[PDB]
């Protein structure tokens, strides 16, 4: 048969037309010709290169573009659009033969090649799927809500007979319905056959609920949701919370006795996914050379300071604290007996309208393992470890909380002041021991919580009062206040020029965002931070001990004389940790003197600005040599 | 202030303990130089050796 003969149909439906052996073999031959002979008039065969790439990568997925097939054989594209299941089976066999043309031993490795159709033209929302789309290919966008675990579904089903013990041949399991055998072919009996799992082959299975993206829903309408079944290679591809686009066959899920509550013969619908498309902190060989090139600049650190939160303007010391917390120091354990913490905890205490929450959102976007939590809010991950039983699943699960979940990362606690008692205790343990101990529901254990904390708080009464010291402006007690390395107090004092530039920045941000209308790039910066966190590990050498010990006594005696809350050893440790964090931005294996001076500047500025104004006036003049 | 005036609890718990230790900040240069050098050797790695 020919393509023009394929255009004419003789059977009652399209599916019965494709079911005929002659039409099936004609479609197989035409798909073979399309797969082996398609070129983009540039002298290269894109599909041959794709087959070679999937063979050398040992993958069972072949991406076939729909517009290529539409330009090549439009009638086969229409057949795929109307009846995708059996034509996809045909093209599975065709692609398998095309792969065996190059690699003759690929059948024993996989024996299954999945064809993924990309760039389907018709775009449907989940709220406009109707009667006409059943057993047809639909391309729908949406946000994944939650996903199930990967389950083994039977693929090549093998039985054994209870009468004789003979093991029967493998049979293909159709995804639509369960398969069953009634004959033994050895003892010639219709006896009870049982499926043995050791000789049965399985495919992976996942069940993913997709809703309409909330941006695109009409006003009074709720976002519609469908359920998508991911097969063997597509499992664990789309994490919940991200906007994804799935091409697949829209079909009915069959259930026993329909629905008794409705009283109408009503079926539920599923989408068997054909392809998943997403609408990464991996550095290549060129990326590390680029990182070394950008590190050798003298003013690299300031650029990172200028790269923190571009939508936030003027809070340079806050951005410096963000950069120090994002890069972090090195933890250490001398002889196993004594442990020194190696990550910077930053407390942003500020009046309303100082854009602390936007800084927290920026860090959540930038950091590798960033966990957002809040004290007053409800729909967020908690700060306390718990053992929780699902009311429906009846399954006990151990939740480590946001502190354990932010291990080797950063935890961002918005509204640090109106926290409750259990969350305060969780934070206290997570900063003291860097671990969380649980004794609940028969589970007695400890979970590592080596997490940096960037917290945001509002002062008591809605304003910072500079006449009172820091402890009287915040509901936080002394031990939890002492655990922070950088203590950024930001206040919106009235300055005319600052107000003018801030208002200009905000109004310009609005006028750029209208629908009718030297910083490092973010993508480079995120991988740079990950690289410096994961491979640098700076170290400080012995001949710089004569200056840090000098400046430590210089601050301690002045703190005694002035009468503020004392400088302890932990301020020296904060100096030495912030120094190791600043040295990471240079990708440096050692700690330099300007590095230490900058860390001392950060710690001195953080200690001074948290004081009574009487303390501020003396401490600014006494520590003028270190602030510079 | 009295030792029982600085505690945020009753004075009976103090009698309840076996040995009490009132730990001081001595607040002088000759001690905090030594403490600073000790902590710097801890961070350096000399103290491990
Ligand atoms: N320095 C700034 N630069 C840019 N935008 C700012 C600045 N200060 C405030 N804003 C804006 O003002 C608004 C304040 O939002 P938030 O970040 O929620 O404030 P906040 O600091 O978290 O104070 P709260 O909500 O009382 S804890 C946002 O629209 C910010 O974009
Ligand atoms: Mg806020
Ligand atoms: Zn038998």
Curated annotation (Swiss-Prot), chain A:
It is an enzyme of class 3 (hydrolase). Keywords: ATP-binding, Cell cycle, DNA replication, DNA-binding, Helicase, Hydrolase, Metal-binding, Nucleotide-binding, Nucleus, Phosphoprotein, Zinc, Zinc-finger. It catalyses: ATP + H2O = ADP + phosphate + H(+). Changing residue 212 to K: In allele MCM2-1. ATP binds at residues 350-357. Residues 300-507 form the MCM domain. Changing residue 356 to A: Reduces MCM2-7 complex helicase activity. Abolishes MCM2-7 complex helicase activity. Reduces MCM2-7 complex helicase activity. Component of the MCM2-7 complex. The complex forms a toroidal hexameric ring with the proposed subunit order MCM2-MCM6-MCM4-MCM7-MCM3-MCM5; loaded onto DNA, forms a head-head double hexamer. Acts as a component of the MCM2-7 complex (MCM complex) which is the putative replicative helicase essential for 'once per cell cycle' DNA replication initiation and elongation in eukaryotic cells. The active ATPase sites in the MCM2-7 ring are formed through the interaction surfaces of two neighboring subunits such that a critical structure of a conserved arginine finger motif is provided in trans relative to the ATP-binding site of the Walker A box of the adjacent subunit. This is DNA replication licensing factor MCM2. The chain holds residues 181 to 866 of 868 of the full protein.
From Swiss-Prot, chain B:
It comes from the Eukaryota. A motif (Arginine finger) lies at residues 15-18. It is found in: Nucleus. Acts as a component of the MCM2-7 complex (MCM complex) which is the putative replicative helicase essential for 'once per cell cycle' DNA replication initiation and elongation in eukaryotic cells. The active ATPase sites in the MCM2-7 ring are formed through the interaction surfaces of two neighboring subunits such that a critical structure of a conserved arginine finger motif is provided in trans relative to the ATP-binding site of the Walker A box of the adjacent subunit. Component of the MCM2-7 complex. The complex forms a toroidal hexameric ring with the proposed subunit order MCM2-MCM6-MCM4-MCM7-MCM3-MCM5; loaded onto DNA, forms a head-head double hexamer. Interacts with CSM1. Present with 10300 molecules/cell in log phase SD medium. Early fractionation of eukaryotic MCM proteins yielded a variety of dimeric, trimeric and tetrameric complexes with unclear biological significance. The MCM2-7 hexamer is the proposed physiological active complex. Belongs to the MCM family. This is Minichromosome maintenance protein 5. It comes from Saccharomyces cerevisiae (strain ATCC 204508 / S288c) (Baker's yeast). The lineage of its organism: Eukaryota, Fungi, Dikarya, Ascomycota, Saccharomycotina. The gene is MCM5. The chain holds residues 534 to 582 of 775 of the full protein.
């Amino acid at each position: 048969l020919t393509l023009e003969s394929l255009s004419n149909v003789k059977a009652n439906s399209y599916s019965e037309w494709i079911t005929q052996p002659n039409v099936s073999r004609t479609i197989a031959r035409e798909l073979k010709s399309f797969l082996l002979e398609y070129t983009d008039e540039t002298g290269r065969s894109v599909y041959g290169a794709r087959i070679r790439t999937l063979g050398e990568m040992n993958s069972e997925s072949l991406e076939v573009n729909y517009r290529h097939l539409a330009e090549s054989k439009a009638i086969l594209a229409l057949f795929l659009a109307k009846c995708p299941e059996e034509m996809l089976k045909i093209f599975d066999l065709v692609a398998m033969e095309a792969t065996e043309l190059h690699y003759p031993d690929y059948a024993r490795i996989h024996s299954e090649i999945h064809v993924r159709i990309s760039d389907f033209p018709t775009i449907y929302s989940l709220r406009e799927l109707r009667e006409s789309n059943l057993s047809s290919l639909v391309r729908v966008t949406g946000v994944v809500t939650r996903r199930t675990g990967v389950f083994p579904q039977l693929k090549y089903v093998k039985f054994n007979c209870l009468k004789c013990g003979s093991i029967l041949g493998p049979f293909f399991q159709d995804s639509n319905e369960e398969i069953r055998i009634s004959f033994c072919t050895n003892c010639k009996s219709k006896g009870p056959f049982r499926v043995n799992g050791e000789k049965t082959v399985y495919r992976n299975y996942q069940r993913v609920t997709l809703q309409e993206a909330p941006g695109t829903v009409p006003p009074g309408r709720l976002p519609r949701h469908r359920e998508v079944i991911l097969l063997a290679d597509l499992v664990d591809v789309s994490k919940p919370g991200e906007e994804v686009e799935v091409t697949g066959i829209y079909k009915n899920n069959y259930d026993g006795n329909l629905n008794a509550k409705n009283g109408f013969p009503v079926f539920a619908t599923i989408i068997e996914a054909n392809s998943i498309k997403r609408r990464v902190f991996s550095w290549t060989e060129e990326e590390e050379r680029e990182f070394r090139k950008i590190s050798r600049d003298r003013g690299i650190i300031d650029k990172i300071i200028s790269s923190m939160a571009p939508s936030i303007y003027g809070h340079r010391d806050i951005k410096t604290a963000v950069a120090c917390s994002l890069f972090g120091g090195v933890p250490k354990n001398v002889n196993g007996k004594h442990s020194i913490r190696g990550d910077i905890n930053v407390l942003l205490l500020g009046d309303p309208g100082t854009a602390k929450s936007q800084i927290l959102k920026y860090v959540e976007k930038t950091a590798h393992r960033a966990v957002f939590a809040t004290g007053q809010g409800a729909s967020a991950v908690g700060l306390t470890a718990s053992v929780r039983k699902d009311p429906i699943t009846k399954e006990w699960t151990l939740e480590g909380g946001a502190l354990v979940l932010a291990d080797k990362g950063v935890c961002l606690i918005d509204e640090f002041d109106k926290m409750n008692d259990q969350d305060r205790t969780s934070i206290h343990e997570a900063m003291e021991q860097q671990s969380i101990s649980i004794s609940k529901a028969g589970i007695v254990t400890t979970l590592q919580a080596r997490c940096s904390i960037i917290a945001a708080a509002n002062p008591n009464g809605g304003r910072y009062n500079s006449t009172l010291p820091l402890a009287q402006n915040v509901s936080l007690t002394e031990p939890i206040l002492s655990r922070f390395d950088i203590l950024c107090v930001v206040r919106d004092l009235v300055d005319e020029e600052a107000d003018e530039r801030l208002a200009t920045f905000v109004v310009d941000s609005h006028v750029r965002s209208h629908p009718e209308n030297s910083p490092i790039p973010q993508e480079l910066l995120m991988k740079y931070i990950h690289y410096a966190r994961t491979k640098i590990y700076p170290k400080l050498h012995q001949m710089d001990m004569d200056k840090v010990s000098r400046v430590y006594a210089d601050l301690r005696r002045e703190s005694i004389s002035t009468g503020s809350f004392p400088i302890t050893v932990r301020h020296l440790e904060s100096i030495l940790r912030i120094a190791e964090s600043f040295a990471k931005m240079r990708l440096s294996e050692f700690v330099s003197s300007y590095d230490l001076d900058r860390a001392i500047k950060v710690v001195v500025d953080s200690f001074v600005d948290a004081q009574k104004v009487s303390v501020r006036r003396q401490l600014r003049r006494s520590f003028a040599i270190y602030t510079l | 202030k009295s030792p029982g005036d600085n505690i945020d609890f009753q004075t009976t718990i103090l009698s309840r303990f076996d040995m009490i230790f009132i730990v001081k900040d001595d607040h002088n240069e000759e001690r905090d130089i030594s403490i600073a050098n000790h902590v710097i050797n801890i961070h350096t790695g000399n103290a491990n050796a």
